[PDB]
Design goal:
The structure is cut from a larger assembly and holds chains A (487 residues), B (466 residues), C (67 residues), D (39 residues) and E (35 residues). With 466 residues, chain B is α/β, with parallel strands linked by helices. Chain B has helices spanning 130-135, 154-166, 182-194, 218-237, 251-263, 277-285, 312-317, 329-332, 352-355, 357-382, 390-406, 426-438, 455-465; strands at residues 2-9, 12-17, 27-30, 38-46, 49-54, 66-69, 75-78, 86-87, 104-107, 124-125, 138-139, 143-148, 172-178, 207-212, 242-248, 295-303, 323-326, 346-347. Chain B has three domains: 2-74, Thrombin, subunit H, CATH 2.40.10; 75-347, Rossmann fold (3-Layer(aba) Sandwich), CATH 3.40.50.300; 357-464, Bovine Mitochondrial F1-atpase, Atp Synthase Beta Chain, Chain D, domain 3 (Bovine Mitochondrial F1-ATPase, ATP Synthase Beta Chain, Chain D, domain3), CATH 1.10.1140.10. Helices cover 42% and strands 0% of the residues of chain C. The relative contact order of chain C is 0.06. The chains are: A alpha/beta (487), B alpha/beta (466), C mainly alpha (67), D mainly alpha (39), E mainly alpha (35). The structure holds adenosine-5'-triphosphate (ATP), adenosine-5'-diphosphate and magnesium ion (2 copies). Adenosine-5'-diphosphate is lined by residues 148, 150-156, 337-338, 410, 413, 416-417 of chain B.
């Protein structure tokens, strides 16, 4: 402005100078600085280079310290001065981050000023033990029919989204994030889910497109986007998931419910492999370090569902894994499959057969299952799952085709649970074995339009009770038969 | 600052500076060579010693030779004077037309555009090619990749894209030859001279050429991509123009990085690649992007080693592209050219809200019928064609007709196939494939759709064969 | 405190701009107008300094009687 | 307006700094006295 | 290595499952009638 750039952006700047313990860069190359000195620096402590850069002290060797650089090592020369910070790596946590795009260290990259964060939180904290947790009961609503019906997800669960490239994993995550809009602006406080999206190793314009999609649907007012893109140093892409997880643990520890998507963890594993090979640590399978399973398990163990003596918070994780040529038996895919509480398998064969989302219901699993569902969706989805199985072994058969064409869904169109259960009702009770599949989606579009235009009271009772009572079942029978007559 | 060479192993030269150790990425000049030998600092080793990477051949380097630090990274001439010229990795004219008289020089090592400079507009770019426009359409300002093994048609397809899009363009174009045949560079130079695109007599040239080919040491093949990037980045930022950036081949960048990483004293990663594969590829690819200061329509040919699409280099370069055109050898054996794999090429603008419901439905129906044919392939191969239902037989017939129709004669192929080059507008593509899907041509033979333009030409060929 | 005073002086000295509104820009005007041009083609082509004109369309109709 | 307010301000923030480096041994005395206050 | 056509899971395994279970579903709904 005209005076507001000196008044406190200068006069208040903490220009103090103090005696600080330092070291000296012996060598620097490929983002790994070997610092002589720093006798009292702690393991995994954040240090600071004389050129404004920052780094984490990973290797504590007898003659030097292996400092990984959070940035570009072009600015660092031999003989530079590395000053301690005294604190292990920590990120700013709070509610102010909601609506911001930050990098792996919590700095704003959307140009909207500093985050007004009061508290900070380590990134390498310990997950809650056995006592602070409780069973995963509340449902996390995605708005996707196949997920919310056959692979339901709870609050506190770790559901893996796994598939090849360009199969629809990011789209599943984006639908899940957009769907929480109805609950977030509503009245019931313990149905609000604050989403978090971690972009690891992605192209920067992809994250720009994603932020545009999430702000077009007004879904950014409750979403944090941590982004360690492909041009960011390997330590930043390795630290992004832990930063995002701490930002979500803030909510989880304070009676609120959060959701975090790691998109994806294959690139975090690759960044960690690079960062550890450059530290001269011996490689393992596929040159990955020995402790990459630990790298992912200590991260996915922090997604918990706390009990009421701890606030009743929650943190649902949705790790993403890319596989090479459908090879699910690789190293990192098998690690993360062993860690998580279920999977959502996507295939390109199903994707090109018109089945979108290409969720393989045969392989998709939810280890919690029915415990993470509403009663009405459970009532319909049991029979729907069994009928879809019966169709998949004999690929009745027309009812199964009708059900699969019912499962198909568009992009960025997350339905409500009430509408979802009404559709799968109209599908499993028999009112669709008369239409030809090439008009099934037409019927559902028109039927949803009609029901949301005329029958808000039935859907309101569905949303209030959670059960499809005999009164509700009869009224829904009425509506579906009359519309089928109209169609 | 003046140092002395203390080690020479291939392309990696160690220098020991008695004072003023140069920063990383600086460009050092070796004293006493017939030509200019530039060493790019890569690491600091301690003991006042740096480990550089030579941009040219290292034969004749003696331990103790003098090396001066220039004080800045490799700087190339940028501007409107580089149009119609050819320059090597370090920015020297290699066309025997004298110096490049520019007013500004830009280092080849710049920071990627930040997050707040990204633009999100995804207008379609029509190419005139059937399979590309139909199933994996390109976008103005997006990043395009043409994958493919050895001898499947990456260069033919990129020359077809140059023929259709480059000379029909308004802005400027940049072709960065990265580790490919020098005779192809000569062919391109002379073709652009005859086509008026490159004009040796005045300043109406529209293409800047940057060439470090497969006869170059690994340092030059690793940095010539950055030289091309820098030229295109000037044309985008300081001119606001809409630039076309063609890179062939972008895999040689990673391959040369691996070759030099062998000697830089680094523990190798998988398939013997550098541990810093994805990070170097990211720091290079995040500069090839459209910002809100200008657009860069990037088409990059990507070689695939041993026809393995899961190799670390192509598997890492997939995540940087807005539209991938994966070529296949199994399809190229059938004479179907271009060999674009229809069930493997994708695009982020294959979106009904963007291309239209008609186009989206035609593309998805073509892909579904091709996937059905692919699923039937096994039974067809073992138990013969007879054991299919007649519905499966109809699906197979329509799918084979669609396969033949996806083929197309290229205008650049007028010298080794004889057939005239067909440029099919988007409407003709959608209409022809919709008609074939509807069954309007279940009486024409499949060899009537092979190597034609619009669908009317397929009908005419069907009539001519009878 | 040569730097306490300088940061408050030089900015107060930057208030000596009423004669030159861009704090002695001395360049970048040649590319500043390119920025708004890129910004203008983002909002269209009309002169956004005046009120917008209008032309209101009418629906397409037929005769719908018993033929 | 926000476009002009941004670039003009960042040009402003660049003017002052390459101006102060253009613009004194009391600092070396001030550094000696400020060093004794560390204790 | 018998049963490999079903262990693979290609086209000849899916059709094995289909053939076998349609035959046995017919036989099952017929045997439920005789009871
Ligand atoms: N439910 C859907 N319906 C229709 N199209 C979809 C659906 N999901 C994804 N797509 C489309 O398929 C393509 C896959 O995009 P997406 O980003 O979701 O997959 P991905 O797993 O993230 O792959 P990658 O990260 O390698 O790009 C997109 O073009 C998208 O438009
Ligand atoms: N679109 C095409 N039409 C006709 N022939 C083609 C086409 N594409 C490739 N070919 C043939 O396949 C060969 C491979 O050409 P090229 O583009 O140089 O492969 P690559 O660059 O991937 O090694 C060519 O010599 C050409 O004869
Ligand atoms: Mg994705
Ligand atoms: Mg080639």
């Amino acid at each position: 402005e005209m005076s507001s750039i000196l008044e406190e952006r200068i006069l208040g700047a903490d220009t103090s100078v103090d005696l600080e313990e330092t070291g000296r860069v012996l060598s620097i190359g490929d983002g790994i600085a070997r610092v002589h000195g720093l006798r009292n620096v702690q393991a995994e402590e954040m240090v600071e280079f004389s050129s404004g850069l920052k780094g984490m002290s990973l290797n504590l060797e007898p003659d030097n310290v292996g400092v990984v650089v959070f940035g570009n090592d072009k600015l660092i020369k031999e003989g530079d001065i590395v000053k301690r910070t005294g604190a292990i790596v920590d990120v700013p946590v709070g509610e102010e981050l909601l609506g911001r795009v930050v990098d792996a260290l919590g700095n704003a990259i959307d140009g909207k000023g500093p985050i007004g964060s009061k508290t900070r939180r380590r990134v390498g904290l310990k997950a809650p033990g056995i006592i602070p947790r409780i069973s995963v009961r509340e449902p996390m609503q995605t708005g996707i029919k196949a997920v919310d019906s056959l692979v339901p997800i709870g609050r506190g669960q770790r559901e893996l989204i796994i598939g090849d490239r360009q199969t629809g994993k990011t789209s599943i995550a984006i639908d899940t994030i957009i769907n929480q809009k109805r609950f977030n602006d509503g009245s019931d406080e313990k149905k609000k889910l604050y989403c978090i999206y971690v972009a690891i190793g992605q192209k920067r314009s992809t994250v720009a497109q994603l932020v545009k999609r999430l702000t077009d649907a007004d879904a950014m007012k409750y979403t944090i986007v941590v982004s360690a893109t492909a041009s960011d140093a390997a330590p930043l892409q390795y630290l992004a998931p832990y930063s995002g997880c701490s930002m979500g643990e803030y909510f989880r520890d304070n009676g609120k419910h959060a959701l975090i998507i790691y998109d994806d963890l294959s690139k975090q594993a690759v960044a960690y492999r690079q960062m550890s090979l450059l530290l001269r640590r011996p490689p393992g399978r596929e040159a990955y370090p020995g402790d990459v399973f630990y790298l992912h398990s200590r991260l996915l163990e922090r997604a918990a569902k706390m009990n009421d003596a701890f606030g009743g918070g929650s943190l649902t994780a949705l790790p993403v894994i890319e596989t090479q040529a459908g090879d699910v038996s690789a190293y990192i895919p098998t690690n993360v499959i062993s860690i998580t509480d279920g999977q959502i398998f996507l295939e390109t064969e199903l994707f090109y057969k018109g089945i979108r989302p290409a969720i393989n219901v045969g392989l998709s699993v939810s280890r919690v299952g029915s415990a993470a569902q509403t009663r009405a969706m459970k009532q319909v989805a049991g029979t729907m799952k069994l009928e879809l199985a019966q169709y998949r072994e004999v690929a009745l058969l027309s009812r199964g085709v009708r059900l699969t064409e019912l499962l198909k869904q568009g992009q960025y169109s997350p339905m409500a649970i009430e509408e979802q259960v009404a559709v799968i009702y109209a599908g499993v009770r028999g009112y669709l074995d008369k239409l030809e599949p090439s008009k099934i989606t037409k019927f559902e579009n028109a039927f949803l339009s009609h029901v949301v235009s005329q029958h808000q009271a039935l859907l309101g009772t569905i949303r209030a009770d959670g059960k499809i009572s005999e009164q509700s079942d009869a009224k829904l029978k009425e509506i579906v038969t009359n519309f089928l007559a109209g169609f | 600052a003046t140092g002395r060479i203390v080690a020479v192993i291939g392309a990696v030269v160690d220098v020991q500076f008695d004072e003023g150790l140069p920063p990383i990425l600086n460009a050092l000049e070796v004293q006493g060579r017939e030509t200019r030998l530039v060493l790019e600092v890569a690491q600091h080793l301690g003991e006042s010693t740096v480990r550089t990477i030579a941009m040219d051949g290292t034969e004749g380097l003696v331990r103790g030779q003098k090396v001066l630090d220039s004080g800045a990274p490799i700087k190339i001439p940028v501007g409107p004077e580089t149009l119609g010229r050819i320059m090597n990795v370090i920015g020297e004219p290699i066309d025997e037309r004298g110096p490049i008289k520019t007013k500004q020089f830009a280092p080849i090592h710049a920071e990627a555009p930040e997050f707040m400079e990204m633009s999100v507009e995804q207008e379609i770019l029509v190419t005139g090619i059937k399979v590309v426009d139909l199933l994996a359409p390109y976008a103005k300002g997006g990043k395009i990749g043409l994958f493919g093994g050895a001898g499947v048609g990456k260069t033919v397809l990129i020359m077809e894209l140059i023929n259709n899009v480059a000379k029909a363009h308004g802005g400027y174009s940049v072709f960065a030859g990265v580790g490919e045949r020098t005779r192809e560079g000569n062919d391109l130079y002379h073709e652009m001279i005859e086509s008026g695109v490159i004009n040796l007599k005045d300043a109406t040239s529209k293409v800047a050429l940057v060439y470090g080919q497969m006869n170059e040491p690994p340092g030059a093949r690793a940095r010539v991509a950055l030289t091309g990037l820098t030229v295109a980045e000037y044309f985008r930022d300081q001119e606001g123009q809409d630039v076309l950036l063609f890179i062939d081949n972008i895999f040689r960048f990673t391959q040369a990085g691996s070759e030099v990483s062998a000697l830089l004293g680094r523990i190798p990663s998988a398939v013997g690649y550098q541990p810093t594969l994805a990070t170097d590829m990211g720091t290079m690819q995040e500069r090839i992007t459209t910002t809100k200061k200008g657009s860069i329509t990037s088409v990059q040919a990507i070689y695939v080693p041993a026809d393995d699409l899961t190799d670390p280099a192509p598997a890492t370069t997939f995540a940087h592209l807005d539209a991938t055109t994966v070529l296949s050898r199994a399809i190229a054996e059938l004479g179907i050219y271009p060999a674009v794999d229809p069930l493997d090429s994708t695009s982020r603008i294959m979106d009904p809200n963007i291309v239209g419901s008609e186009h989206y439905d035609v593309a998805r129906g073509v892909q579904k019928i091709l996937q059905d044919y692919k699923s039937l392939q096994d039974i067809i191969a073992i138990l013969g064609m007879d054991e299919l239902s007649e519905e499966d037989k109809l699906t197979v017939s329509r799918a084979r007709k669609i396969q033949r129709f996806l083929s197309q004669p290229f205008q650049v192929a007028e010298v080794f196939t004889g057939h005239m080059g067909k440029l099919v507008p988007l409407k003709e593509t959608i209409k022809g494939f919709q008609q074939i899907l509807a069954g309007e041509y279940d009486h024409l033979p499949e060899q009537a759709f092979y190597m034609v333009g619009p669908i009317e030409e397929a009908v005419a060929k069907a009539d001519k064969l009878a | 405190q040569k730097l306490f005073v300088d940061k408050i002086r030089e900015y107060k000295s930057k208030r000596q701009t009423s004669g030159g509104p861009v704090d002695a820009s001395s360049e970048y005007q040649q590319e500043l107008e390119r920025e708004l041009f890129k910004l203008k083609q983002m909002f269209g082509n009309a002169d956004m300094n005046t009120f917008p004109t209008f032309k209101f369309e009418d629906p397409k109709f037929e005769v719908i009687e018993k033929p | 307006q926000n476009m002009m307010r941004r670039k003009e301000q960042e040009h402003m923030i660049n003017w002052v700094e390459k101006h102060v480096v253009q613009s004194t041994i009391a600092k070396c005395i001030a550094d000696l006295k400020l060093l004794a206050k560390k204790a | 290595g018998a049963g490999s056509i079903r262990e693979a899971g290609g086209a000849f395994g899916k059709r094995e499952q289909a053939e076998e279970e349609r035959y046995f579903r017919a036989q099952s709904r017929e045997q439920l009638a005789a009871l």
